[PDB]
Design an enzyme around this catalytic site. Structure first.
Site, PDB file in Angstrom:
ATOM      1  N   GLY A  44      -8.873  -4.943   7.754  1.00 28.20           N
ATOM      2  CA  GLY A  44      -8.178  -3.708   8.099  1.00 28.20           C
ATOM      3  C   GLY A  44      -8.212  -3.537   9.605  1.00 28.20           C
ATOM      4  N   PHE A  45      -7.301  -4.210  10.314  1.00 26.68           N
ATOM      5  CA  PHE A  45      -7.451  -4.362  11.761  1.00 26.68           C
ATOM      6  C   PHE A  45      -7.296  -3.054  12.521  1.00 26.68           C
ATOM      7  CE2 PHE A  45      -2.922  -4.283  11.500  1.00 26.68           C
ATOM      8  CZ  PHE A  45      -2.456  -3.930  12.774  1.00 26.68           C
ATOM      9  N   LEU A  46      -6.624  -2.059  11.942  1.00 21.99           N
ATOM     10  CA  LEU A  46      -6.477  -0.793  12.650  1.00 21.99           C
ATOM     11  C   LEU A  46      -7.798  -0.045  12.693  1.00 21.99           C
ATOM     12  CD1 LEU A  46      -3.050   0.037  11.188  1.00 21.99           C
ATOM     13  CD2 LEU A  46      -3.498  -0.520  13.571  1.00 21.99           C
ATOM     14  N   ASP A  47      -8.427   0.165  11.528  1.00 17.36           N
ATOM     15  CA  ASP A  47      -9.736   0.814  11.518  1.00 17.36           C
ATOM     16  C   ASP A  47     -10.724   0.027  12.353  1.00 17.36           C
ATOM     17  OD1 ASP A  47      -9.504   2.388   8.360  1.00 17.36           O
ATOM     18  OD2 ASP A  47     -10.268   3.335  10.190  1.00 17.36           O
TER      19      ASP A  47
ATOM     20  N   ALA B 230       5.060   5.991  -5.339  1.00 17.81           N
ATOM     21  CA  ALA B 230       4.128   5.206  -6.135  1.00 17.81           C
ATOM     22  C   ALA B 230       4.843   4.474  -7.266  1.00 17.81           C
ATOM     23  CB  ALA B 230       3.015   6.107  -6.677  1.00 17.81           C
ATOM     24  N   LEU B 231       5.792   5.139  -7.937  1.00 17.18           N
ATOM     25  CA  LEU B 231       6.594   4.462  -8.953  1.00 17.18           C
ATOM     26  C   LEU B 231       7.366   3.292  -8.350  1.00 17.18           C
ATOM     27  CD1 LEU B 231       7.874   7.531 -11.000  1.00 17.18           C
ATOM     28  CD2 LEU B 231       6.483   5.660 -11.896  1.00 17.18           C
ATOM     29  N   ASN B 232       8.044   3.528  -7.215  1.00 19.01           N
ATOM     30  CA  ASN B 232       8.810   2.472  -6.556  1.00 19.01           C
ATOM     31  C   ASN B 232       7.917   1.297  -6.188  1.00 19.01           C
ATOM     32  OD1 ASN B 232      11.236   3.888  -6.722  1.00 19.01           O
ATOM     33  ND2 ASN B 232      11.058   4.765  -4.664  1.00 19.01           N
TER      34      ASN B 232
ATOM     35  N   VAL C 278       0.853  -1.188   0.000  1.00 17.55           N
ATOM     36  CA  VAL C 278       0.000   0.000   0.000  1.00 17.55           C
ATOM     37  C   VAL C 278       0.888   1.236   0.000  1.00 17.55           C
ATOM     38  CG1 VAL C 278      -1.852   1.245   1.145  1.00 17.55           C
ATOM     39  CG2 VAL C 278      -1.788  -1.254   1.247  1.00 17.55           C
TER      40      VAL C 278
ATOM     41  N   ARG D 263      -7.344   2.591  -3.986  1.00 17.51           N
ATOM     42  CA  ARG D 263      -8.244   2.674  -2.836  1.00 17.51           C
ATOM     43  C   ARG D 263      -8.951   4.026  -2.900  1.00 17.51           C
ATOM     44  NH1 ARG D 263      -6.883   1.213   3.472  1.00 17.51           N
ATOM     45  NH2 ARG D 263      -5.426   2.969   3.258  1.00 17.51           N
TER      46      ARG D 263
ATOM     47  N   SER E 139       3.305   8.915   7.956  1.00 17.17           N
ATOM     48  CA  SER E 139       4.579   9.354   8.526  1.00 17.17           C
ATOM     49  C   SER E 139       5.127   8.310   9.488  1.00 17.17           C
ATOM     50  CB  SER E 139       4.430  10.703   9.271  1.00 17.17           C
ATOM     51  OG  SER E 139       3.903  11.693   8.409  1.00 17.17           O
TER      52      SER E 139
END
Ligand SMILES: O=C(O)/C(O)=C/C(=O)c1ccc2c(c1)OCCO2
Ligand SMILES: [Mg+2]
EC number: 2.3.3.9
Length: 712
Positions: free
Chosen positions: A447-450, A126-128, A117, A330, A608
């Site tokens: 999505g365990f965090l949400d 995004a390229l990488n 993600v 997403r 971050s």
């Protein structure tokens, strides 16, 4: 006003121009028909979208009241469950069924492997990430703590051969484990050759082939002196690079230069929780990046997308392998609006509706030649839809996608849905949610965090919750993880759709990731989330060790979680913590909130690396922020801590965050003059009042306030 009138809509000029000049050319969609479609879909579907959000608020108010009117701390599960059923929160389970989704690519239906993600607004990242389909295992091992920096094996300014030798030995063992030789070990290989379409590995005293010759997939260069040897195991490719005159190859007994792993099989280009985009200028930056990815011409300075990889088959023909990760996008969920478009009353348009129209339109370019290759060979557009609550919200997404397909002239069901299972009302109705999307679903993912954020907010009135670190091992979450796999496998996901699990966020604890994250494919997940190309290469190791297809087959028909387990609220026990542990939890959450929010509000950065109270680096996005802010709000709500504890922690942690940061506005010493500090405070003090604990409303307002103050 710098807006364009289309029907009832007033479109920001920067967005109107971007679509006309960049997105539409090459799709054969008439510009005027597209824009009339935007207006028609927005008008038709906004009312239902609003009704869905109101239903969330009504259900939550009823649950709040249910808790407020009772006394007995051990919740009577029988009555609680009858209540949830009565109010329509817990719905009947549908009869068994098999999903019918078609036109899906092999990376999703068949291959098990890492899923990366990345924030779409960072074109370089995004390229990488798109290029992370292939990654150097030597680089991932040397550069991370998977090889401990013990005495003599430290990373220095130049190549440490003692360390490199440990890297080499690690990869030889992986080869032995993954593509075993008939006899002997890869660690003793002196050379590789191809003879009569078979791989021959020279040993000191003899030669040998593979125990399974079918794991030989190809080579490059001359068969009698190849430049690389290509293997396959559990559907994932391994490439041994042979170069005795290279810096590493010179030291190697077989002249091996590197071991390349097929790594990020798929990548999620993220418009949601890992980016900060609060107006049309921000959305256009992301849309433009998504466009360049799908047209293949995205270039960040020149870093460009990789070409496909060319091989010689074992017999001797030629074939190619994809050079790029298969891309999902997403979209944002059903909640937020964005003033990139407003109606005639000045009301902002729903952002999820806009994302479906614009990322859908842009994705058409990824179905056509990239002035050579495609994103989807089978003709699908892959959209992750986050933060849905229950089957009716899934159905709404299906209808939205159907209406967008009509506007874009796409075949129906071209737009596929990766369903995030990251909200409690989706968890407890998961089978019905999959059925609502049975002809569009390409994954479910925990999505365990949400999901932890929603857990806290949903039961906010029940009592004080366990600490944030405790949440990962609570009964509700382990049942949620197993229940997700059970539902997917019972709906026929094996060989048809991904069963996915959540993100590893400790970006520098790679030895821990390699040791621990193997649990996810062991649990039958055919994919799981990684935060970097490096982590994708290392997590690929787990898919060589674990035969996910065999695991899923052995789990078939099992029912390992009950509804009562799923509904087990993570309430803290009587006298759970010493005062020093309460202090540490408050400090840890405040540091996590402040370090994330200051870069969100001041610099528009939505993901971050923030060191926690133990200086472990955590990659943070909105979901982890949802957890921390909701937990502190829950502790404040129930008298675990005071508002003075919160303020003192925020003020204590802020100068440390200022230290850790550099077009950077410090928050200390005048905290209440810092928009970012005030945002952090508001996320906690108003957390109990945010819809389902969502952070976007406050983050968006405060980031816009900062942008406005910066423009004067
Ligand atoms: O658990 C979920 O709710 C969920 O959706 C997680 C994320 O969105 C997430 C977390 C960390 C990231 C990231 C995304 O993308 C960039 C790398 O760091
Ligand atoms: Mg999430």
């Amino acid at each position: 006003t710098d807006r364009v009138s289309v029907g009832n809509l007033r479109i920001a000029r920067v967005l109107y121009d971007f679509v006309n000049n960049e997105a539409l050319p090459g799709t054969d969609i008439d510009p005027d028909s597209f824009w009339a479609g935007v207006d028609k879909v927005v008008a038709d579907l906004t009312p239902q979208n609003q009704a869905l959000l109101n239903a969330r608020d009504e259900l939550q108010a009823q649950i709040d009241k249910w808790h407020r009117r009772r006394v007995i701390e051990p919740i009577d599960m029988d009555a609680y469950r009858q209540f949830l059923t009565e109010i329509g929160y817990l719905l009947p389970e549908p009869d068994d069924f098999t999903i019918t989704t078609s036109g899906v690519d092999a990376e999703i239906t068949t291959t098990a492997g890492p899923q990366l993600v990345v924030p779409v607004l960072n074109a370089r990242f995004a390229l990488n990430a798109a290029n992370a389909r292939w990654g150097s295992l030597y680089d991932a091992l040397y550069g991370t703590d998977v090889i401990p920096e013990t005495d003599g094996a430290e990373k220095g300014p130049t190549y440490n051969k003692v360390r490199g030798d440990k890297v080499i030995a690690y990869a030889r063992k992986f080869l032995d484990d993954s593509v075993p030789l008939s006899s002997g070990s890869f660690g003793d290989a002196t050379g590789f050759t191809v003879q009569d379409g078979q791989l021959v590995v020279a040993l000191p005293d003899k030669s040998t082939g593979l125990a399974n010759p079918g794991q030989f997939a190809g080579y490059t260069g001359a068969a009698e002196s190849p430049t690389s040897v290509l293997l396959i195991n559990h559907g994932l490719h391994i490439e041994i690079l042979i170069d005795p005159e290279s810096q590493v190859g010179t030291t190697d007994r077989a002249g091996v230069k590197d071991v390349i792993l097929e790594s990020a099989i798929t990548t999620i280009m993220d418009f949601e929780d890992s980016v900060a985009a609060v107006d049309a200028a921000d959305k256009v930056l992301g849309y433009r990046n998504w466009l360049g990815l799908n047209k293949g011409d995205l270039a960040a300075a020149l870093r460009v997308l990789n070409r496909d990889r060319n091989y010689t088959a074992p017999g001797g023909g030629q074939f190619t392998l994809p050079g790029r990760s298969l891309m999902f996008v997403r979209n944002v969920g059903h909640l937020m609006t964005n003033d990139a478009i407003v109606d005639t009353d000045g009301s902002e348009v729903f952002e999820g509706i806009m994302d479906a129209l614009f990322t859908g339109l842009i994705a058409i370019h990824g179905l056509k030649a990239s002035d050579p290759l495609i994103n989807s060979r089978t003709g699908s557009i892959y959209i992750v839809k986050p933060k849905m609550h229950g089957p009716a919200e899934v159905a709404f997404t299906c209808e939205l996608f159907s209406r967008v397909e009509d506007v874009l002239g796409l075949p129906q069901n071209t737009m596929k849905i990766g369903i995030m299972d990251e909200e409690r009302r989706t968890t407890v109705n998961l089978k019905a949610c999959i059925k609502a999307a049975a002809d569009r679903v390409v994954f479910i993912n925990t999505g365990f965090l949400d999901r932890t954020g929603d857990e806290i907010h949903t039961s906010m009135e029940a009592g004080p919750m366990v600490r944030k670190g405790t949440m990962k091992s609570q009964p509700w979450i382990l049942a949620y993880e197993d229940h997700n796999v059970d539902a997917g496998l019972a709906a026929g996901f094996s060989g048809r759709a991904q069963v996915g699990k959540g993100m590893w966020t400790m970006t520098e604890l790679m030895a821990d990731m390699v040791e621990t994250k193997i649990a996810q494919p062991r649990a039958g997940a055919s994919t799981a989330w990684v935060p970097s190309p490096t982590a994708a290469t290392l997590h690929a190791l787990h898919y060589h060790q674990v035969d996910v297809a065999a695991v899923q087959q052995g789990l078939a028909g099992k029912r390992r979680a009950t509804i009562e387990q799923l509904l087990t609220i993570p309430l803290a026990k009587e006298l759970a913590w010493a005062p020093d542990e309460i202090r540490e939890e408050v400090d840890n959450n405040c540091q996590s909130i402040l370090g994330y929010v200051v870069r969100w509000v001041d610099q528009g950065v939505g993901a971050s690396k923030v060191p926690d109270i133990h200086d472990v680096a955590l990659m943070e996005d909105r979901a982890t922020l949802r957890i921390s802010s909701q937990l502190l709000a829950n502790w404040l709500r129930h008298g675990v801590i005071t508002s003075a504890d919160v303020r003192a922690s925020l003020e204590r942690m802020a100068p440390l965050v200022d230290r850790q940061n550099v077009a950077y506005r410090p928050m200390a010493p005048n905290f209440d003059d810092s928009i970012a500090f005030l945002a952090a405070q508001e996320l906690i003090l108003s957390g109990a009042q945010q819809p389902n604990g969502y952070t976007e409303p406050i983050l968006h307002r405060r980031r816009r306030e900062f942008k406005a103050r910066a423009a004067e």
